[PDB]
Structure formats: structure tokens, C-alpha cells
Amino acid sequence: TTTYDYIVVGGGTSGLVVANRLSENPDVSVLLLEAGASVFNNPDVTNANGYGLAFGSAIDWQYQSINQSYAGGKQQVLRAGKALGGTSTINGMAYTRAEDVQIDVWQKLGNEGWTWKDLLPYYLKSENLTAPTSSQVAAGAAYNPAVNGKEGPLKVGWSGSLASGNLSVALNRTFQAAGVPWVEDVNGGKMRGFNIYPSTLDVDLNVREDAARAYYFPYDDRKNLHLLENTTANRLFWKNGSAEEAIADGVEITSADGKVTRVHAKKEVIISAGALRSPLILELSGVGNPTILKKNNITPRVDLPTVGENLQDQFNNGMAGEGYGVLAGASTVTYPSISDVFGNETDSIVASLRSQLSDYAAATVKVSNGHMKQEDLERLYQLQFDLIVKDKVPIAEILFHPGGGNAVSSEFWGLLPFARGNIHISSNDPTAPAAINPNYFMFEWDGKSQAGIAKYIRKILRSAPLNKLIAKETKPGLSEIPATAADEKWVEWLKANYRSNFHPVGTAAMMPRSIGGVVDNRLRVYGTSNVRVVDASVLPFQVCGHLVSTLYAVAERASDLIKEDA
Ligand SMILES: Cc1cc2nc3c(=O)[nH]c(=O)nc-3n(C[C@H](O)[C@H](O)[C@H](O)COP(=O)(O)OP(=O)(O)OC[C@H]3O[C@@H](n4cnc5c(N)ncnc54)[C@H](O)[C@@H]3O)c2cc1C
Ligand SMILES: OC[C@H]1OC=C[C@@H](O)[C@@H]1O
Ligand SMILES: OC[C@H]1OC=C[C@@H](O)[C@@H]1O
Ligand SMILES: OC[C@H]1OC=C[C@@H](O)[C@@H]1O
Numbered sequence: 001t002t003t004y005d006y007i008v009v010g011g012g013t014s015g016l017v018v019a020n021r022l023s024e025n026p027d028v029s030v031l032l033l034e035a036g037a038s039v040f041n042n043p044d045v046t047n048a049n050g051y052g053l054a055f056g057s058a059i060d061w062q063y064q065s066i067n068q069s070y071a072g073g074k075q076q077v078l079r080a081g082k083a084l085g086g087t088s089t090i091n092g093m094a095y096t097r098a099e100d101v102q103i104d105v106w107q108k109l110g111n112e113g114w115t116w117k118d119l120l121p122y123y124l125k126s127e128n129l130t131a132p133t134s135s136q137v138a139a140g141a142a143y144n145p146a147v148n149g150k151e152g153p154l155k156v157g158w159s160g161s162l163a164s165g166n167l168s169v170a171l172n173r174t175f176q177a178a179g180v181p182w183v184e185d186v187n188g189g190k191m192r193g194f195n196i197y198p199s200t201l202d203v204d205l206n207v208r209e210d211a212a213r214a215y216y217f218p219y220d221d222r223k224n225l226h227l228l229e230n231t232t233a234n235r236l237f238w239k240n241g242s243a244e245e246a247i248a249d250g251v252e253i254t255s256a257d258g259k260v261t262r263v264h265a266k267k268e269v270i271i272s273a274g275a276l277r278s279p280l281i282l283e284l285s286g287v288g289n290p291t292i293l294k295k296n297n298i299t300p301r302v303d304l305p306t307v308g309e310n311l312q313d314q315f316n317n318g319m320a321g322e323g324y325g326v327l328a329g330a331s332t333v334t335y336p337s338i339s340d341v342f343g344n345e346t347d348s349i350v351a352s353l354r355s356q357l358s359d360y361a362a363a364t365v366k367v368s369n370g371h372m373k374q375e376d377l378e379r380l381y382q383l384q385f386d387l388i389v390k391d392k393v394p395i396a397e398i399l400f401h402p403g404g405g406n407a408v409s410s411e412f413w414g415l416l417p418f419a420r421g422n423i424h425i426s427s428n429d430p431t432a433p434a435a436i437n438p439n440y441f442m443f444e445w446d447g448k449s450q451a452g453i454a455k456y457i458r459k460i461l462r463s464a465p466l467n468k469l470i471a472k473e474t475k476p477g478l479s480e481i482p483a484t485a486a487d488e489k490w491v492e493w494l495k496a497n498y499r500s501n502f503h504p505v506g507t508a509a510m511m512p513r514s515i516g517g518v519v520d521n522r523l524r525v526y527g528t529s530n531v532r533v534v535d536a537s538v539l540p541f542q543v544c545g546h547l548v549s550t551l552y553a554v555a556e557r558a559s560d561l562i563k564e565d566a
Contacts, residue, residue: 003264004031004226006562007251008272009233009281011036012086013548014535014555015272016215017126020153021559023225028566030225031263033253036082037229039210040217045089046207048159054090059083063276063436065500070419071315071441072495078313078436079502080274084229085212087274087502088548093199093208095156096333096545097123097553099393100189105383109540110512111521116189122556123187123549124149130157130203139164139330140172140182140196147188153214154552157203158196158330165329166469167402168196172332174466178459180340191335191394191544200548211548230256234430235284236269236531237262238301246287246301246528254430267566268530272555275536276423279308279507279518280434282533283425287525289371296428302527305371306516310509311421312542313438314413314501317450317494319457320475323406327469331401335394335544341449341456349452350389353445357381360418360443367420367439372516380515384416384541394544396453408470412453413501415544417446423507438504441495450498451490503547508537522561534558 008019011034023030036059039045044053054060061080067073081087098116106114127149132141139162148156172182175194183193200209207213219225232254239247250264271278282288286301288308293300339346361377387393398412421439426432441447461470472478476493511517513526517540523532534555536547543550 002262003266004029005265005267006270007031007033007263007265008270009033009251010086010271010273010277010535011084011212011216011227012081012272012274012535013088013211014551015270016085016211017552017555018270018272018534018559018562019225020215020219021556022562023219023222026222026224028224032225032227033231033233033251033263034084034227034229035232037084038212039083039085039089040212042083042089045083045210048093048201048206048208050208051092055079060090064433065436065438068438068440070439071498076438076440076500078276078438078500078504080276083212084216084227085210088200088211089208091502091548092546093201094333094546095187095198095200095549096191097187097189097549098543098545099191099387099391101391102387102393102541102543105387106510106540109380109383110515111510111540113521114510119553119557120147120189122553123147125152125556126154126549126552127152128155129198130155132158136162140168141198141330142184142196143198144185144188147185153218154200155202155209155214156198157201158198159201160203160206162196162330163328165327165402167327167400167408168329168332170466170469171400174460174463175334177463178340180334180336186333186335186545187549192337192340192392194332194334196330197333228253228255232430233273233281234260235281237285246531248528248531265530268532268562270532270534270562272533272535275311275504275507276434276436278533278535278537279423280425282307282508282525284428284430287527291369292424296425298428302525304518304526306368306509307518308423308507309368309371309420310506310516310540311423311436311438311504312417312419312506313421313440313504314415314417314542315440315450315498316411316413316501317454317498318475319410319412319454319461319473320403321408321461321470322472322474323408323469324471325406327402327406327408329402331399334398336396336398336456337392338388338395339392341395341452353385353389356444357385363442364420367422376515381418384418388416395449397544398453398457406471410457412457414446414449414453416542417449418443419446420506438500440498440500447491447494448487450494451487454490454494503542505536505539505542508533509540510538511540522565523558532558532562
């Protein structure tokens with residue numbers, strides 16, 4: 001009665017794709033475990049304009065970091081969805097992908113079959129784009145038909161009430177004048193430009209299109225798909241046979257009544273609990289760094305000491321201005337390259353960055369206590385440097401939002417900081433909060449590029465024709481940060497005001513085992529026959545865009561690889 005073909009741990013963004021796709025075969029039983037519950041009727045979730053409302057609610061995990069010692073010492077909340085649909089139920093709904101070359105880098109580092117060309121069909125498979133109406137087109141909405149799916153479970157589109165307004169027009173003009181042109185679609189692998197970006201939105205219903213509305217509810221009549229809500233997976237348990245290679249037998253779970261039981265998988269266990277939980281589930285299962293496992297009285301089943309290592313996150317800051325009159329229009333994204341941000345000063349930045357890479361690697365070696373090697377980190381950091389410097393991938397995302405009335409706000413983040421940190425269990429008790437350390441601001445580039453982006457936004461606000469609409473900068477403003485402020489003043493302000501960008505990746509990184517990878521190119525955990533991780537943990541580097549689009553694609557492709565292996 002407790003045995004299924006597949007168990008999917010975590011009914012979130014990625015997990016629901018896998019469960020949907022594997023359950024397409026009516027002879028295959030799939031169990032979805034989700035710690036949260038349906039949010040189908042939760043108004044903080046459905047509200048197309050509700051971003052932020054669910055923060056700190058019962059559907060926000062509100063994980064917390066350790067003291068961020070490079071960023072001024074304060075702990076940071078790392079938000080995540082506790083709900084059927086996971087973090088897709090609380091996020092900002094922005095749908096943007098990745099630069100083609102940064103996916104190509106996955107195959108370059110040794111992950112066979114992972115390139116932009118290979119992944120594109122899976123972005124398409126996931127997506128159902130509603131074409132813009134004539135009023136949305138007038139507002140600046142656009143897409144390239146060749147790179148947007150029409151039939152996928154995930155509805156994508158623009159707010160029915162998108163309208164032309166003075167702010168978005170002026171932003172387009174002002175960015176073009178700065179050398180950054182409008183692009184019709186940031187989702188065809190070339191992200192550089194200004195764009196009126198689409199959202200994970202059911203345009204007809206006018207509700208947020210979360211992963212459960214996309215991949216679960218339309219298919220909940222399937223008799224071979226089983227869901228356990230309010231059910232927490234604690235750890236995997238293993239078959240007791242002869243092979244050195246570990247074979248997962250099942251998952252230990254805790255139900256709502258607090259009872260602890262076992263469910264079993266005949267084929268595979270897929271862990272999709274998020275970048276801040278999936279590596280913990282591995283550690284509690286005996287897969288991880290033996291020193292950490294032994295300190296917590298867990299016998300290692302697999303010696304894989306980079307479980308929870310290579311944590312990479314971005315950090316988010318905000319600026320604001322005030323108009324002479326009412327400011328209106330679409331929200332806009334700009335993806336500037338390094339030369340867009342730093343202009344005729346880029347060569348000095350590149351030289352300084354180039355000179356710092358070996359030192360960044362050496363610092364990062366110690367973060368994992370030597371479990372990533374100097375040589376390996378130098379090569380990984382060189383790949384990131386080359387994307388920034390040679391391929392000119394965007395180094396920032398800059399959002400502008402009308403704030404109602406005369407307010408305009410910008411939120412922005414450096415896309416490719418070098419800081420790596422980690423996440424590890426704090427005890428053998430599955431309910432104990434983990435030690436999460438993203439190492440924000442660890443490296444000079446990380447903070448100084450963020451300062452360069454903030455300065456760029458200050459310059460944009462004061463540039464023509466936008467400056468015809470903007471009376472003053474209000475945040476930070478010229479009192480807090482004088483026109484003559486040194487870089488340190490900017491960095492200090494940024495450290496005082498930043499938050500996590502809630503973009504963590506890399507804690508079960510897809511890389512060859514010999515360079516510190518946790519999963520292979522089929523997302524199988526090294527040392528196991530039948531355990532996979534399918535969620536943001538597996539991305540080996542940050543991507544330029546917003547995570548769900550890529551996680552849906554990765555989960556779509558992973559589903560085919562699982563099917564092939566069966
Ligand atoms: C505030 C915020 C804003 C964001 N803005 C955007 C945006 O605009 N656009 C975008 O594309 N991305 C955005 N992101 C990022 C994006 O939403 C996430 O990266 C993505 O949803 C993560 O997907 P996932 O599959 O890795 O994990 P999740 O979607 O977090 O799924 C993990 C699931 O596992 C469950 N779970 C955890 N532990 C257990 C356990 N032990 N047992 C059973 N279940 C468990 C969780 O409840 C959750 O449902 C945002 C994120 C946040 C937090
Ligand atoms: O490929 C065979 C089966 O493998 C796993 C799940 C099912 O969806 C497939 O039909
Ligand atoms: O850290 C390397 C460079 O990164 C960005 C701006 C410069 O101030 C730095 O020297
Ligand atoms: O839509 C903007 C959001 O997108 C990504 C994560 C959050 O930090 C941002 O506010």
C-alpha cells in the first residue's frame with residue numbers, strides 16, 4: 001500500500017513538471033510529497049498584482065542565513081514558497097530565460113547534452129504564450145514567435161490592462177541613447193536590451209500562473225498521480241544489498257498528525273525540494289561530506305562532500321525617483337552588458353577583475369574546507385569571466401516600475417557575482433533550521449559591479465529624455481549619497497539596504513564528479529543508482545534571467561531523460 005514507481009519530493013516549480021510528465025503513462029504510479037498545501041484559492045497567490053503580499057505568511061518558509069560577514073554582519077531572510085506550486089506561488093511572475101552561451105557553458109564544463117540548442121525545445125514545450133492585443137502592442141509588448149511555445153502547460157503573457165504611458169516610452173528612448181536598444185524578445189537566447197517583459201500570468205482569468213495551476217490542477221483526475229499535502233520528507237532510506245552503489249528504497253515522511261512513516265519507490269526518487277532543502281535531504285540520507293555527517297551522527301552512505309557547497313545567489317537593491325507629474329506605463333527590464341554599464345572605463349574594470357580571479361578561487365577553496373580545488377575553481381571562474389568579458393552577457397537586471405502617482409522605482413541586481421557559499425544541516429533533526437551562508441559581497445567585483453549599476457541608474461534618471469519627466473532622485477538621493485561620493489559610500493549604502501534576490505543555485509550542482517559535481521548529466525546523484533535532484537540546486541552557475549522559465553525547461557528535459565532510463 002506504500003509502494004509507488006516514482007516518488008517526487010517537493011511539489012514546487014520543478015517537482016510538479018516531473019510528476020506531471022512521469023504520470024503521462026497511466027501504468028506508472030507517481031507520489032508527490034509536498035510540505036505545504038493547495039493555494040488555488042489563496043488571494044495573496046491568485047492576485048495578478050499581489051507580489052509581496054504573501055511575504056512572511058504561512059506559505060513563506062522564511063529561511064534565514066547566518067551572519068553575512070562580508071556584507072556588514074546582518075542575517076538575511078531567504079524566501080521560498082511553502083505550497084503546492086512552491087516558490088512559483090509567491091514570486092514576482094517575471095518570465096525571462098538565459099543567454100544562449102551560458103547554457104552552452106554547461107556542456108563545455110562536461111555536462112553532455114546541455115546546450116541552448118538542446119534546451120530550447122523544452123522551454124517551448126513548457127510554455128503557452130498569449131499573443132499581445134493591439135493595446136498591449138501599443139504599450140511596447142512584443143515577442144519572437146520562433147522562441148515561444150503555444151501549447152505548453154505554463155501560461156505566459158501580459159496584464160490585460162497594460163497601457164502606453166510616458167515613463168516606458170521615455171525609458172526606451174533614454175536607454176537607446178545610452179547605447180542599449182529595445183529588443184523584441186529577451187527569451188531567444190540574446191538577452192541584452194530594453195524590453196516590456198512577459199509574466200507567468202493567465203491573461204484570460206487575470207490570475208498568477210503558478211506551477212500547480214499549470215502542471216497539476218488540470219491533470220488532477222489522473223488515478224496514477226497521488227499527492228500528499230502537509231507531508232514533509234525527512235530523508236531517503238536505502239536498500240540493504242551488496243553493491244557499493246546506493247539504491248534508494250524510499251522516503252521517510254512526517255504527516256500532519258505528526259506521525260512518521262515510510263513510502264517506497266520501485267524505480268526512482270526525484271528530489272525537487274528547492275536549492276535550500278534538496279541538499280539537506282541528501283545530507284540526512286547519508287549523502288554528503290563525511291565530516292559533517294559524522295559530526296551529526298549520520299553514517300555516510302555516499303562520500304560526496306560538495307553536497308550543499310557551491311551555493312550561489314544574487315543580491316537586490318532599489319532606487320527611486322519622483323516625477324514633475326504623474327508617471328505611467330509598463331514595467332520594463334534592461335539587461336546591460338559590462339560595457340553598457342561602465343562604458344569607456346570597461347578595460348580597467350576587466351583588467352582588475354582578470355587580476356583577481358585566482359585570489360577569488362583561493363578564498364572559495366576554504367569555504368568548502370578544501371573540497372573544491374584551486375585549479376578547478378580557477379577554471380570555473382574563468383568560464384564566468386569569459387561570459388562577462390568575451391561573450392558580453394548581461395551583468396545586471398534593471399527593472400523600472402511605475403509606483404503610482406509621481407513615483408518611479410527601480411530594482412536591480414548584479415547577475416554574475418563570484419561569491420560562493422554553502423548550506424548544511426545544523427543537526428540530525430529534520431526540523432532544525434539549516435546553516436545557510438550565501439557569502440554576499442564576499443568579492444570586490446560583487447560589490448563594485450553593484451555600485452556601478454546603481455551609479456548607472458542614477459545617470460539614467462538624469463539623462464534625456466527621461467530627465468524631462470523626473471524631478472529628483474529620492475532613493476538614495478543626493479543628500480544620502482552626494483554626487484561626489486566615493487565608491488565606498490555606494491558600497492556601504494548597498495550593504496545597508498540590500499536583500500537576497502532569492503535566486504539560489506548550485507547546492508547539488510550538475511558538473512562532472514571529478515570537478516566537485518553532485519549530479520551527473522542525467523541529474524542522477526553520484527554514488528546512487530536511482531536518486532535524482534531536479535530543481536535549482538543543479539544549476540552549476542547563475543543564469544541572467546528569472547529562474548522559473550529555466551527550471552521548467554530543465555525539469556521538462558529531465559523528465560524525458562528519466563523516461564528514457566526506464
Ligand atoms: C520573492 C521571490 C521572488 C521571485 N521572483 C521571480 C520572478 O519574478 N520570476 C522567476 O522566474 N523567478 C522568481 N523567483 C525565483 C523562482 O520563483 C524560484 O527560483 C523557483 O520557483 C524555485 O523553484 P524550485 O523547483 O527550485 O523550488 P520550489 O518552487 O521552492 O519548490 C520546492 C518545493 O518543495 C517543498 N519542500 C521543501 N522541503 C520539503 C520537504 N522536506 N518535504 C516535502 N516538500 C518540501 C516546498 O514547499 C516547495 O513546494 C523569485 C523567488 C522569490 C522567493
Ligand atoms: O519510458 C517508460 C516510462 O518511464 C517513466 C515514466 C513513464 O512516463 C514512461 O512511460
Ligand atoms: O573587482 C574588479 C572591479 O569590478 C568592478 C569595478 C571595479 O571597481 C573593480 O576593481
Ligand atoms: O520580479 C522582480 C523579482 O524577481 C526576482 C526576485 C526578486 O528579488 C525580484 O523582486
